[PDB]
Design a protein around this ligand. Structure first.
Ligand SMILES: CS(=O)(=O)c1cccc(Nc2nccc(-c3sc(N4CCOCC4)nc3-c3cccc(NS(=O)(=O)c4c(F)cccc4F)c3)n2)c1
Ligand SMILES: CS(=O)(=O)c1cccc(Nc2nccc(-c3sc(N4CCOCC4)nc3-c3cccc(NS(=O)(=O)c4c(F)cccc4F)c3)n2)c1
Lengths: 255, 274
C-alpha cells in the first residue's frame, strides 16, 4: 500500500529541474520534518513501489498528480564528474563504489518479475545521497544510447559502459562533436569515446580490466555485451582492494 | 507495492548474528542481488505482519527486502546494517573509546524522526519495545529502527505497562518514555539503573518514581545544550503519561540544537570510530 500525500503538506516548494517525464521540485514535509522531492505528472507508481532496493530512488507516496520521493542532496553523477571547480578531486575508491552501486541497482531491476529495464541510463539521472551513495531514478541526449536503437536486455549495459568511461576520465564523451547527428553517425560505424593515456591515464586502479569491461559493454553486437551478473562478478574483486576508510576519506574530501 | 519471495538457497555465506525472543538473526548474501542481507528466522499471520511493516517507507526504519516462504522455515529478509546496534556503540568502550557529540545528536534526531514518522502513519504504527539494542546503525552510522513489538530488559518500559492490558498496549505515550531513557543512555554512555542488582528492584524504584541519575558524574557539564536536553529527558520520562510530549514537539526542540553542528563534524565523528 502506497501512502497518499495531500499537496498542502509539501511546504517550502522550490523547482529543481524540468523535463519531458515531468517537472521535479524539492519541498519539506510538514509532518515528517524532512526534505522530499515531488515530480508533477498512477498505475506505473505501484510498479515503482515494487522497484524497492538500496540503489533505486525511494518513493515515499502519491499526490492525488505527483510522485513524492526522497530528496538526494548531492544531485547527479553528472554534476560530480564535470563541476571540476566545486570538485577538483574525486578519489578512485568513491568512483569505483559509484560504478559498483550503479551495476547493483540496474541488476536488481533486470532481476524483477517481469524484468524492468531502465532504457534511459545517463549520468544525469544517477542521483547521489548525503553519503554519496547512488540512487537510480528517471526510468534529449544520445551519447549513452546503443547504435541499434537509432525491447533489448542489452541496452542498459551500453549506457553503463559509456557512464564507466565518463567516470574514469571525467571527460565529456564525444567532446569535440557539436552535432548529435555526427555522434549518431560515428557510433553506427562502430566508433566510440577514445581509449588512450590522455582520456584514461595509467594511474587508474585496475585500468586494463575496466577497459575490457567498457569495450565489451559498448560492443557493436548486442549479443557480445555482458549481463549485469557477469559485470558484477568482474567488479567484486576490484572493490575488495579498497579499505572501507578510503571511501569515507574520499567523501570527506568532497565536503 | 509487492513484497518478493526469496528462495532460501538464493542466500549464500550465512553467518549467525544474534538469537532473540523474535527469532535468530543471520547475515547472508543474495546470490542474484550480490548484496549482503540480514535474515530473521522465525504463515498467513506473518505475511500480513510483513505487509504492515512493508508500508513503512522511511529513511530511518529498517527496509524489508523480501520474505523467505519455505515449508521448513519462515524468514524476513532486510537490509544488512553493518555497524550493529546503538547499544554496542554506547557500551563497547574498548572498540569505541571516543563517540563525538555531533554523531550522538545525529543519532537522537534520527531516532526521533523515525518514531514520529511511524506515529504519523494511518493507522499509527507504535513500536512499544524501543531500546538501544534495536536502533541499528548503517555503514555511515545513520539510524534504522527495527524489532517492533508486534526475556528482555525492562529499563525502557514506562511504569504503567508493567501490568499490561487494553489501555497500556493502545498507549501513545509509551515510545516517548523509552526515548528519554535512550537519550539519557546516549549522553551518558552509562547503563540505566546500573547500581540496582535486580531488574525486579528496578521495577519497584521506577513505579515509586525513581529514574537513572541526572547528575555531573553521569551527565558532564561539557554536554552541548545540557539544559534543553535534561529538560526534554525529564519531560519524556514523566510518571503521568499526559505530561509526556509528542515526537513533533520533541523534534521542534531538537532542530536548533542540530543547526549548531557543522556538516563536516558528523563525517569527522565517523572517521574517528572507523
Ligand atoms: C539540478 S538536479 O536536478 O541535478 C538536483 C540538484 C540537487 C538536488 C537534486 N535532488 C533530487 N532529489 C530527488 C530526486 C531528484 C530528481 S533530479 C531528476 N532529474 C531527472 C533528469 O535529469 C535531471 C535530474 N529527477 C529527479 C526525480 C524525482 C522524482 C522521481 C524521479 N524518477 S522516477 O519517476 O523514475 C521514480 C519514481 F517516480 C518513484 C521511485 C523511483 C523513481 F526512480 C526522478 N533530484 C537534484
Ligand atoms: C550482534 S547484532 O545482532 O547487534 C548485529 C551485529 C552486526 C550487524 C547486524 N546487522 C543487522 N542488520 C539488519 C538487521 C539486524 C537485526 S539485529 C536484531 N536484533 C534484535 C534486537 O536485539 C539486537 C539484535 N534484529 C535485527 C532484525 C532483523 C530483521 C528484522 C528485524 N525487525 S522486524 O522483524 O521488526 C522488521 C521487519 F520484519 C521488516 C521491516 C522492518 C522491521 F523492523 C530486526 N542486524 C546486527
Amino acid at each position: 500500500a502506497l501512502p497518499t500525500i495531500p499537496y498542502h503538506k509539501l511546504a517550502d516548494l522550490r523547482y529543481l529541474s524540468r523535463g519531458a517525464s515531468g517537472t521535479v521540485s524539492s519541498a519539506r514535509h510538514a509532518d515528517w520534518r524532512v526534505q522530499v522531492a515531488v515530480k508533477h505528472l498512477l498505475r506505473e507508481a505501484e510498479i515503482l513501489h515494487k522497484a524497492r532496493f538500496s540503489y533505486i530512488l525511494p518513493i515515499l507516496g502519491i499526490c492525488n498528480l505527483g510522485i513524492v520521493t526522497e530528496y538526494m542532496p548531492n544531485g547527479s553523477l553528472n554534476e560530480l564528474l564535470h563541476r571540476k571547480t566545486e570538485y577538483p578531486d574525486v578519489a578512485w575508491p568513491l568512483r569505483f563504489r559509484i560504478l559498483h552501486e550503479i551495476a547493483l541497482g540496474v541488476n536488481y531491476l533486470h532481476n524483477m518479475t517481469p524484468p524492468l529495464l531502465h532504457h534511459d541510463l545517463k549520468t544525469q539521472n544517477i542521483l547521489l545521497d548525503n553519503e554519496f551513495h547512488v540512487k537510480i531514478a528517471d526510468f534529449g541526449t544520445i551519447i549513452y544510447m546503443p547504435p541499434e536503437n537509432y525491447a533489448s536486455i542489452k541496452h542498459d549495459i551500453y549506457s553503463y559502459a559509456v557512464i564507466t568511461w565518463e567516470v574514469l576520465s571525467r571527460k565529456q564523451p564525444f567532446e569535440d562533436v557539436t552535432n548529435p547527428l555526427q555522434i549518431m553517425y560515428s557510433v553506427s560505424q562502430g566508433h566510440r569515446p577514445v581509449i588512450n593515456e590522455e582520456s584514461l591515464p595509467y594511474d587508474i586502479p585496475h585500468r586494463a580490466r575496466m577497459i575490457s569491461l567498457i569495450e565489451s559493454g559498448w560492443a557493436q553486437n548486442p549479443d557480445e555485451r555482458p549481463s549485469f551478473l557477469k559485470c558484477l562478478i568482474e567488479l567484486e574483486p576490484v572493490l575488495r582492494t579498497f579499505e572501507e576508510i578510503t571511501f569515507l576519506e574520499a567523501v570527506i574530501q568532497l565536503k
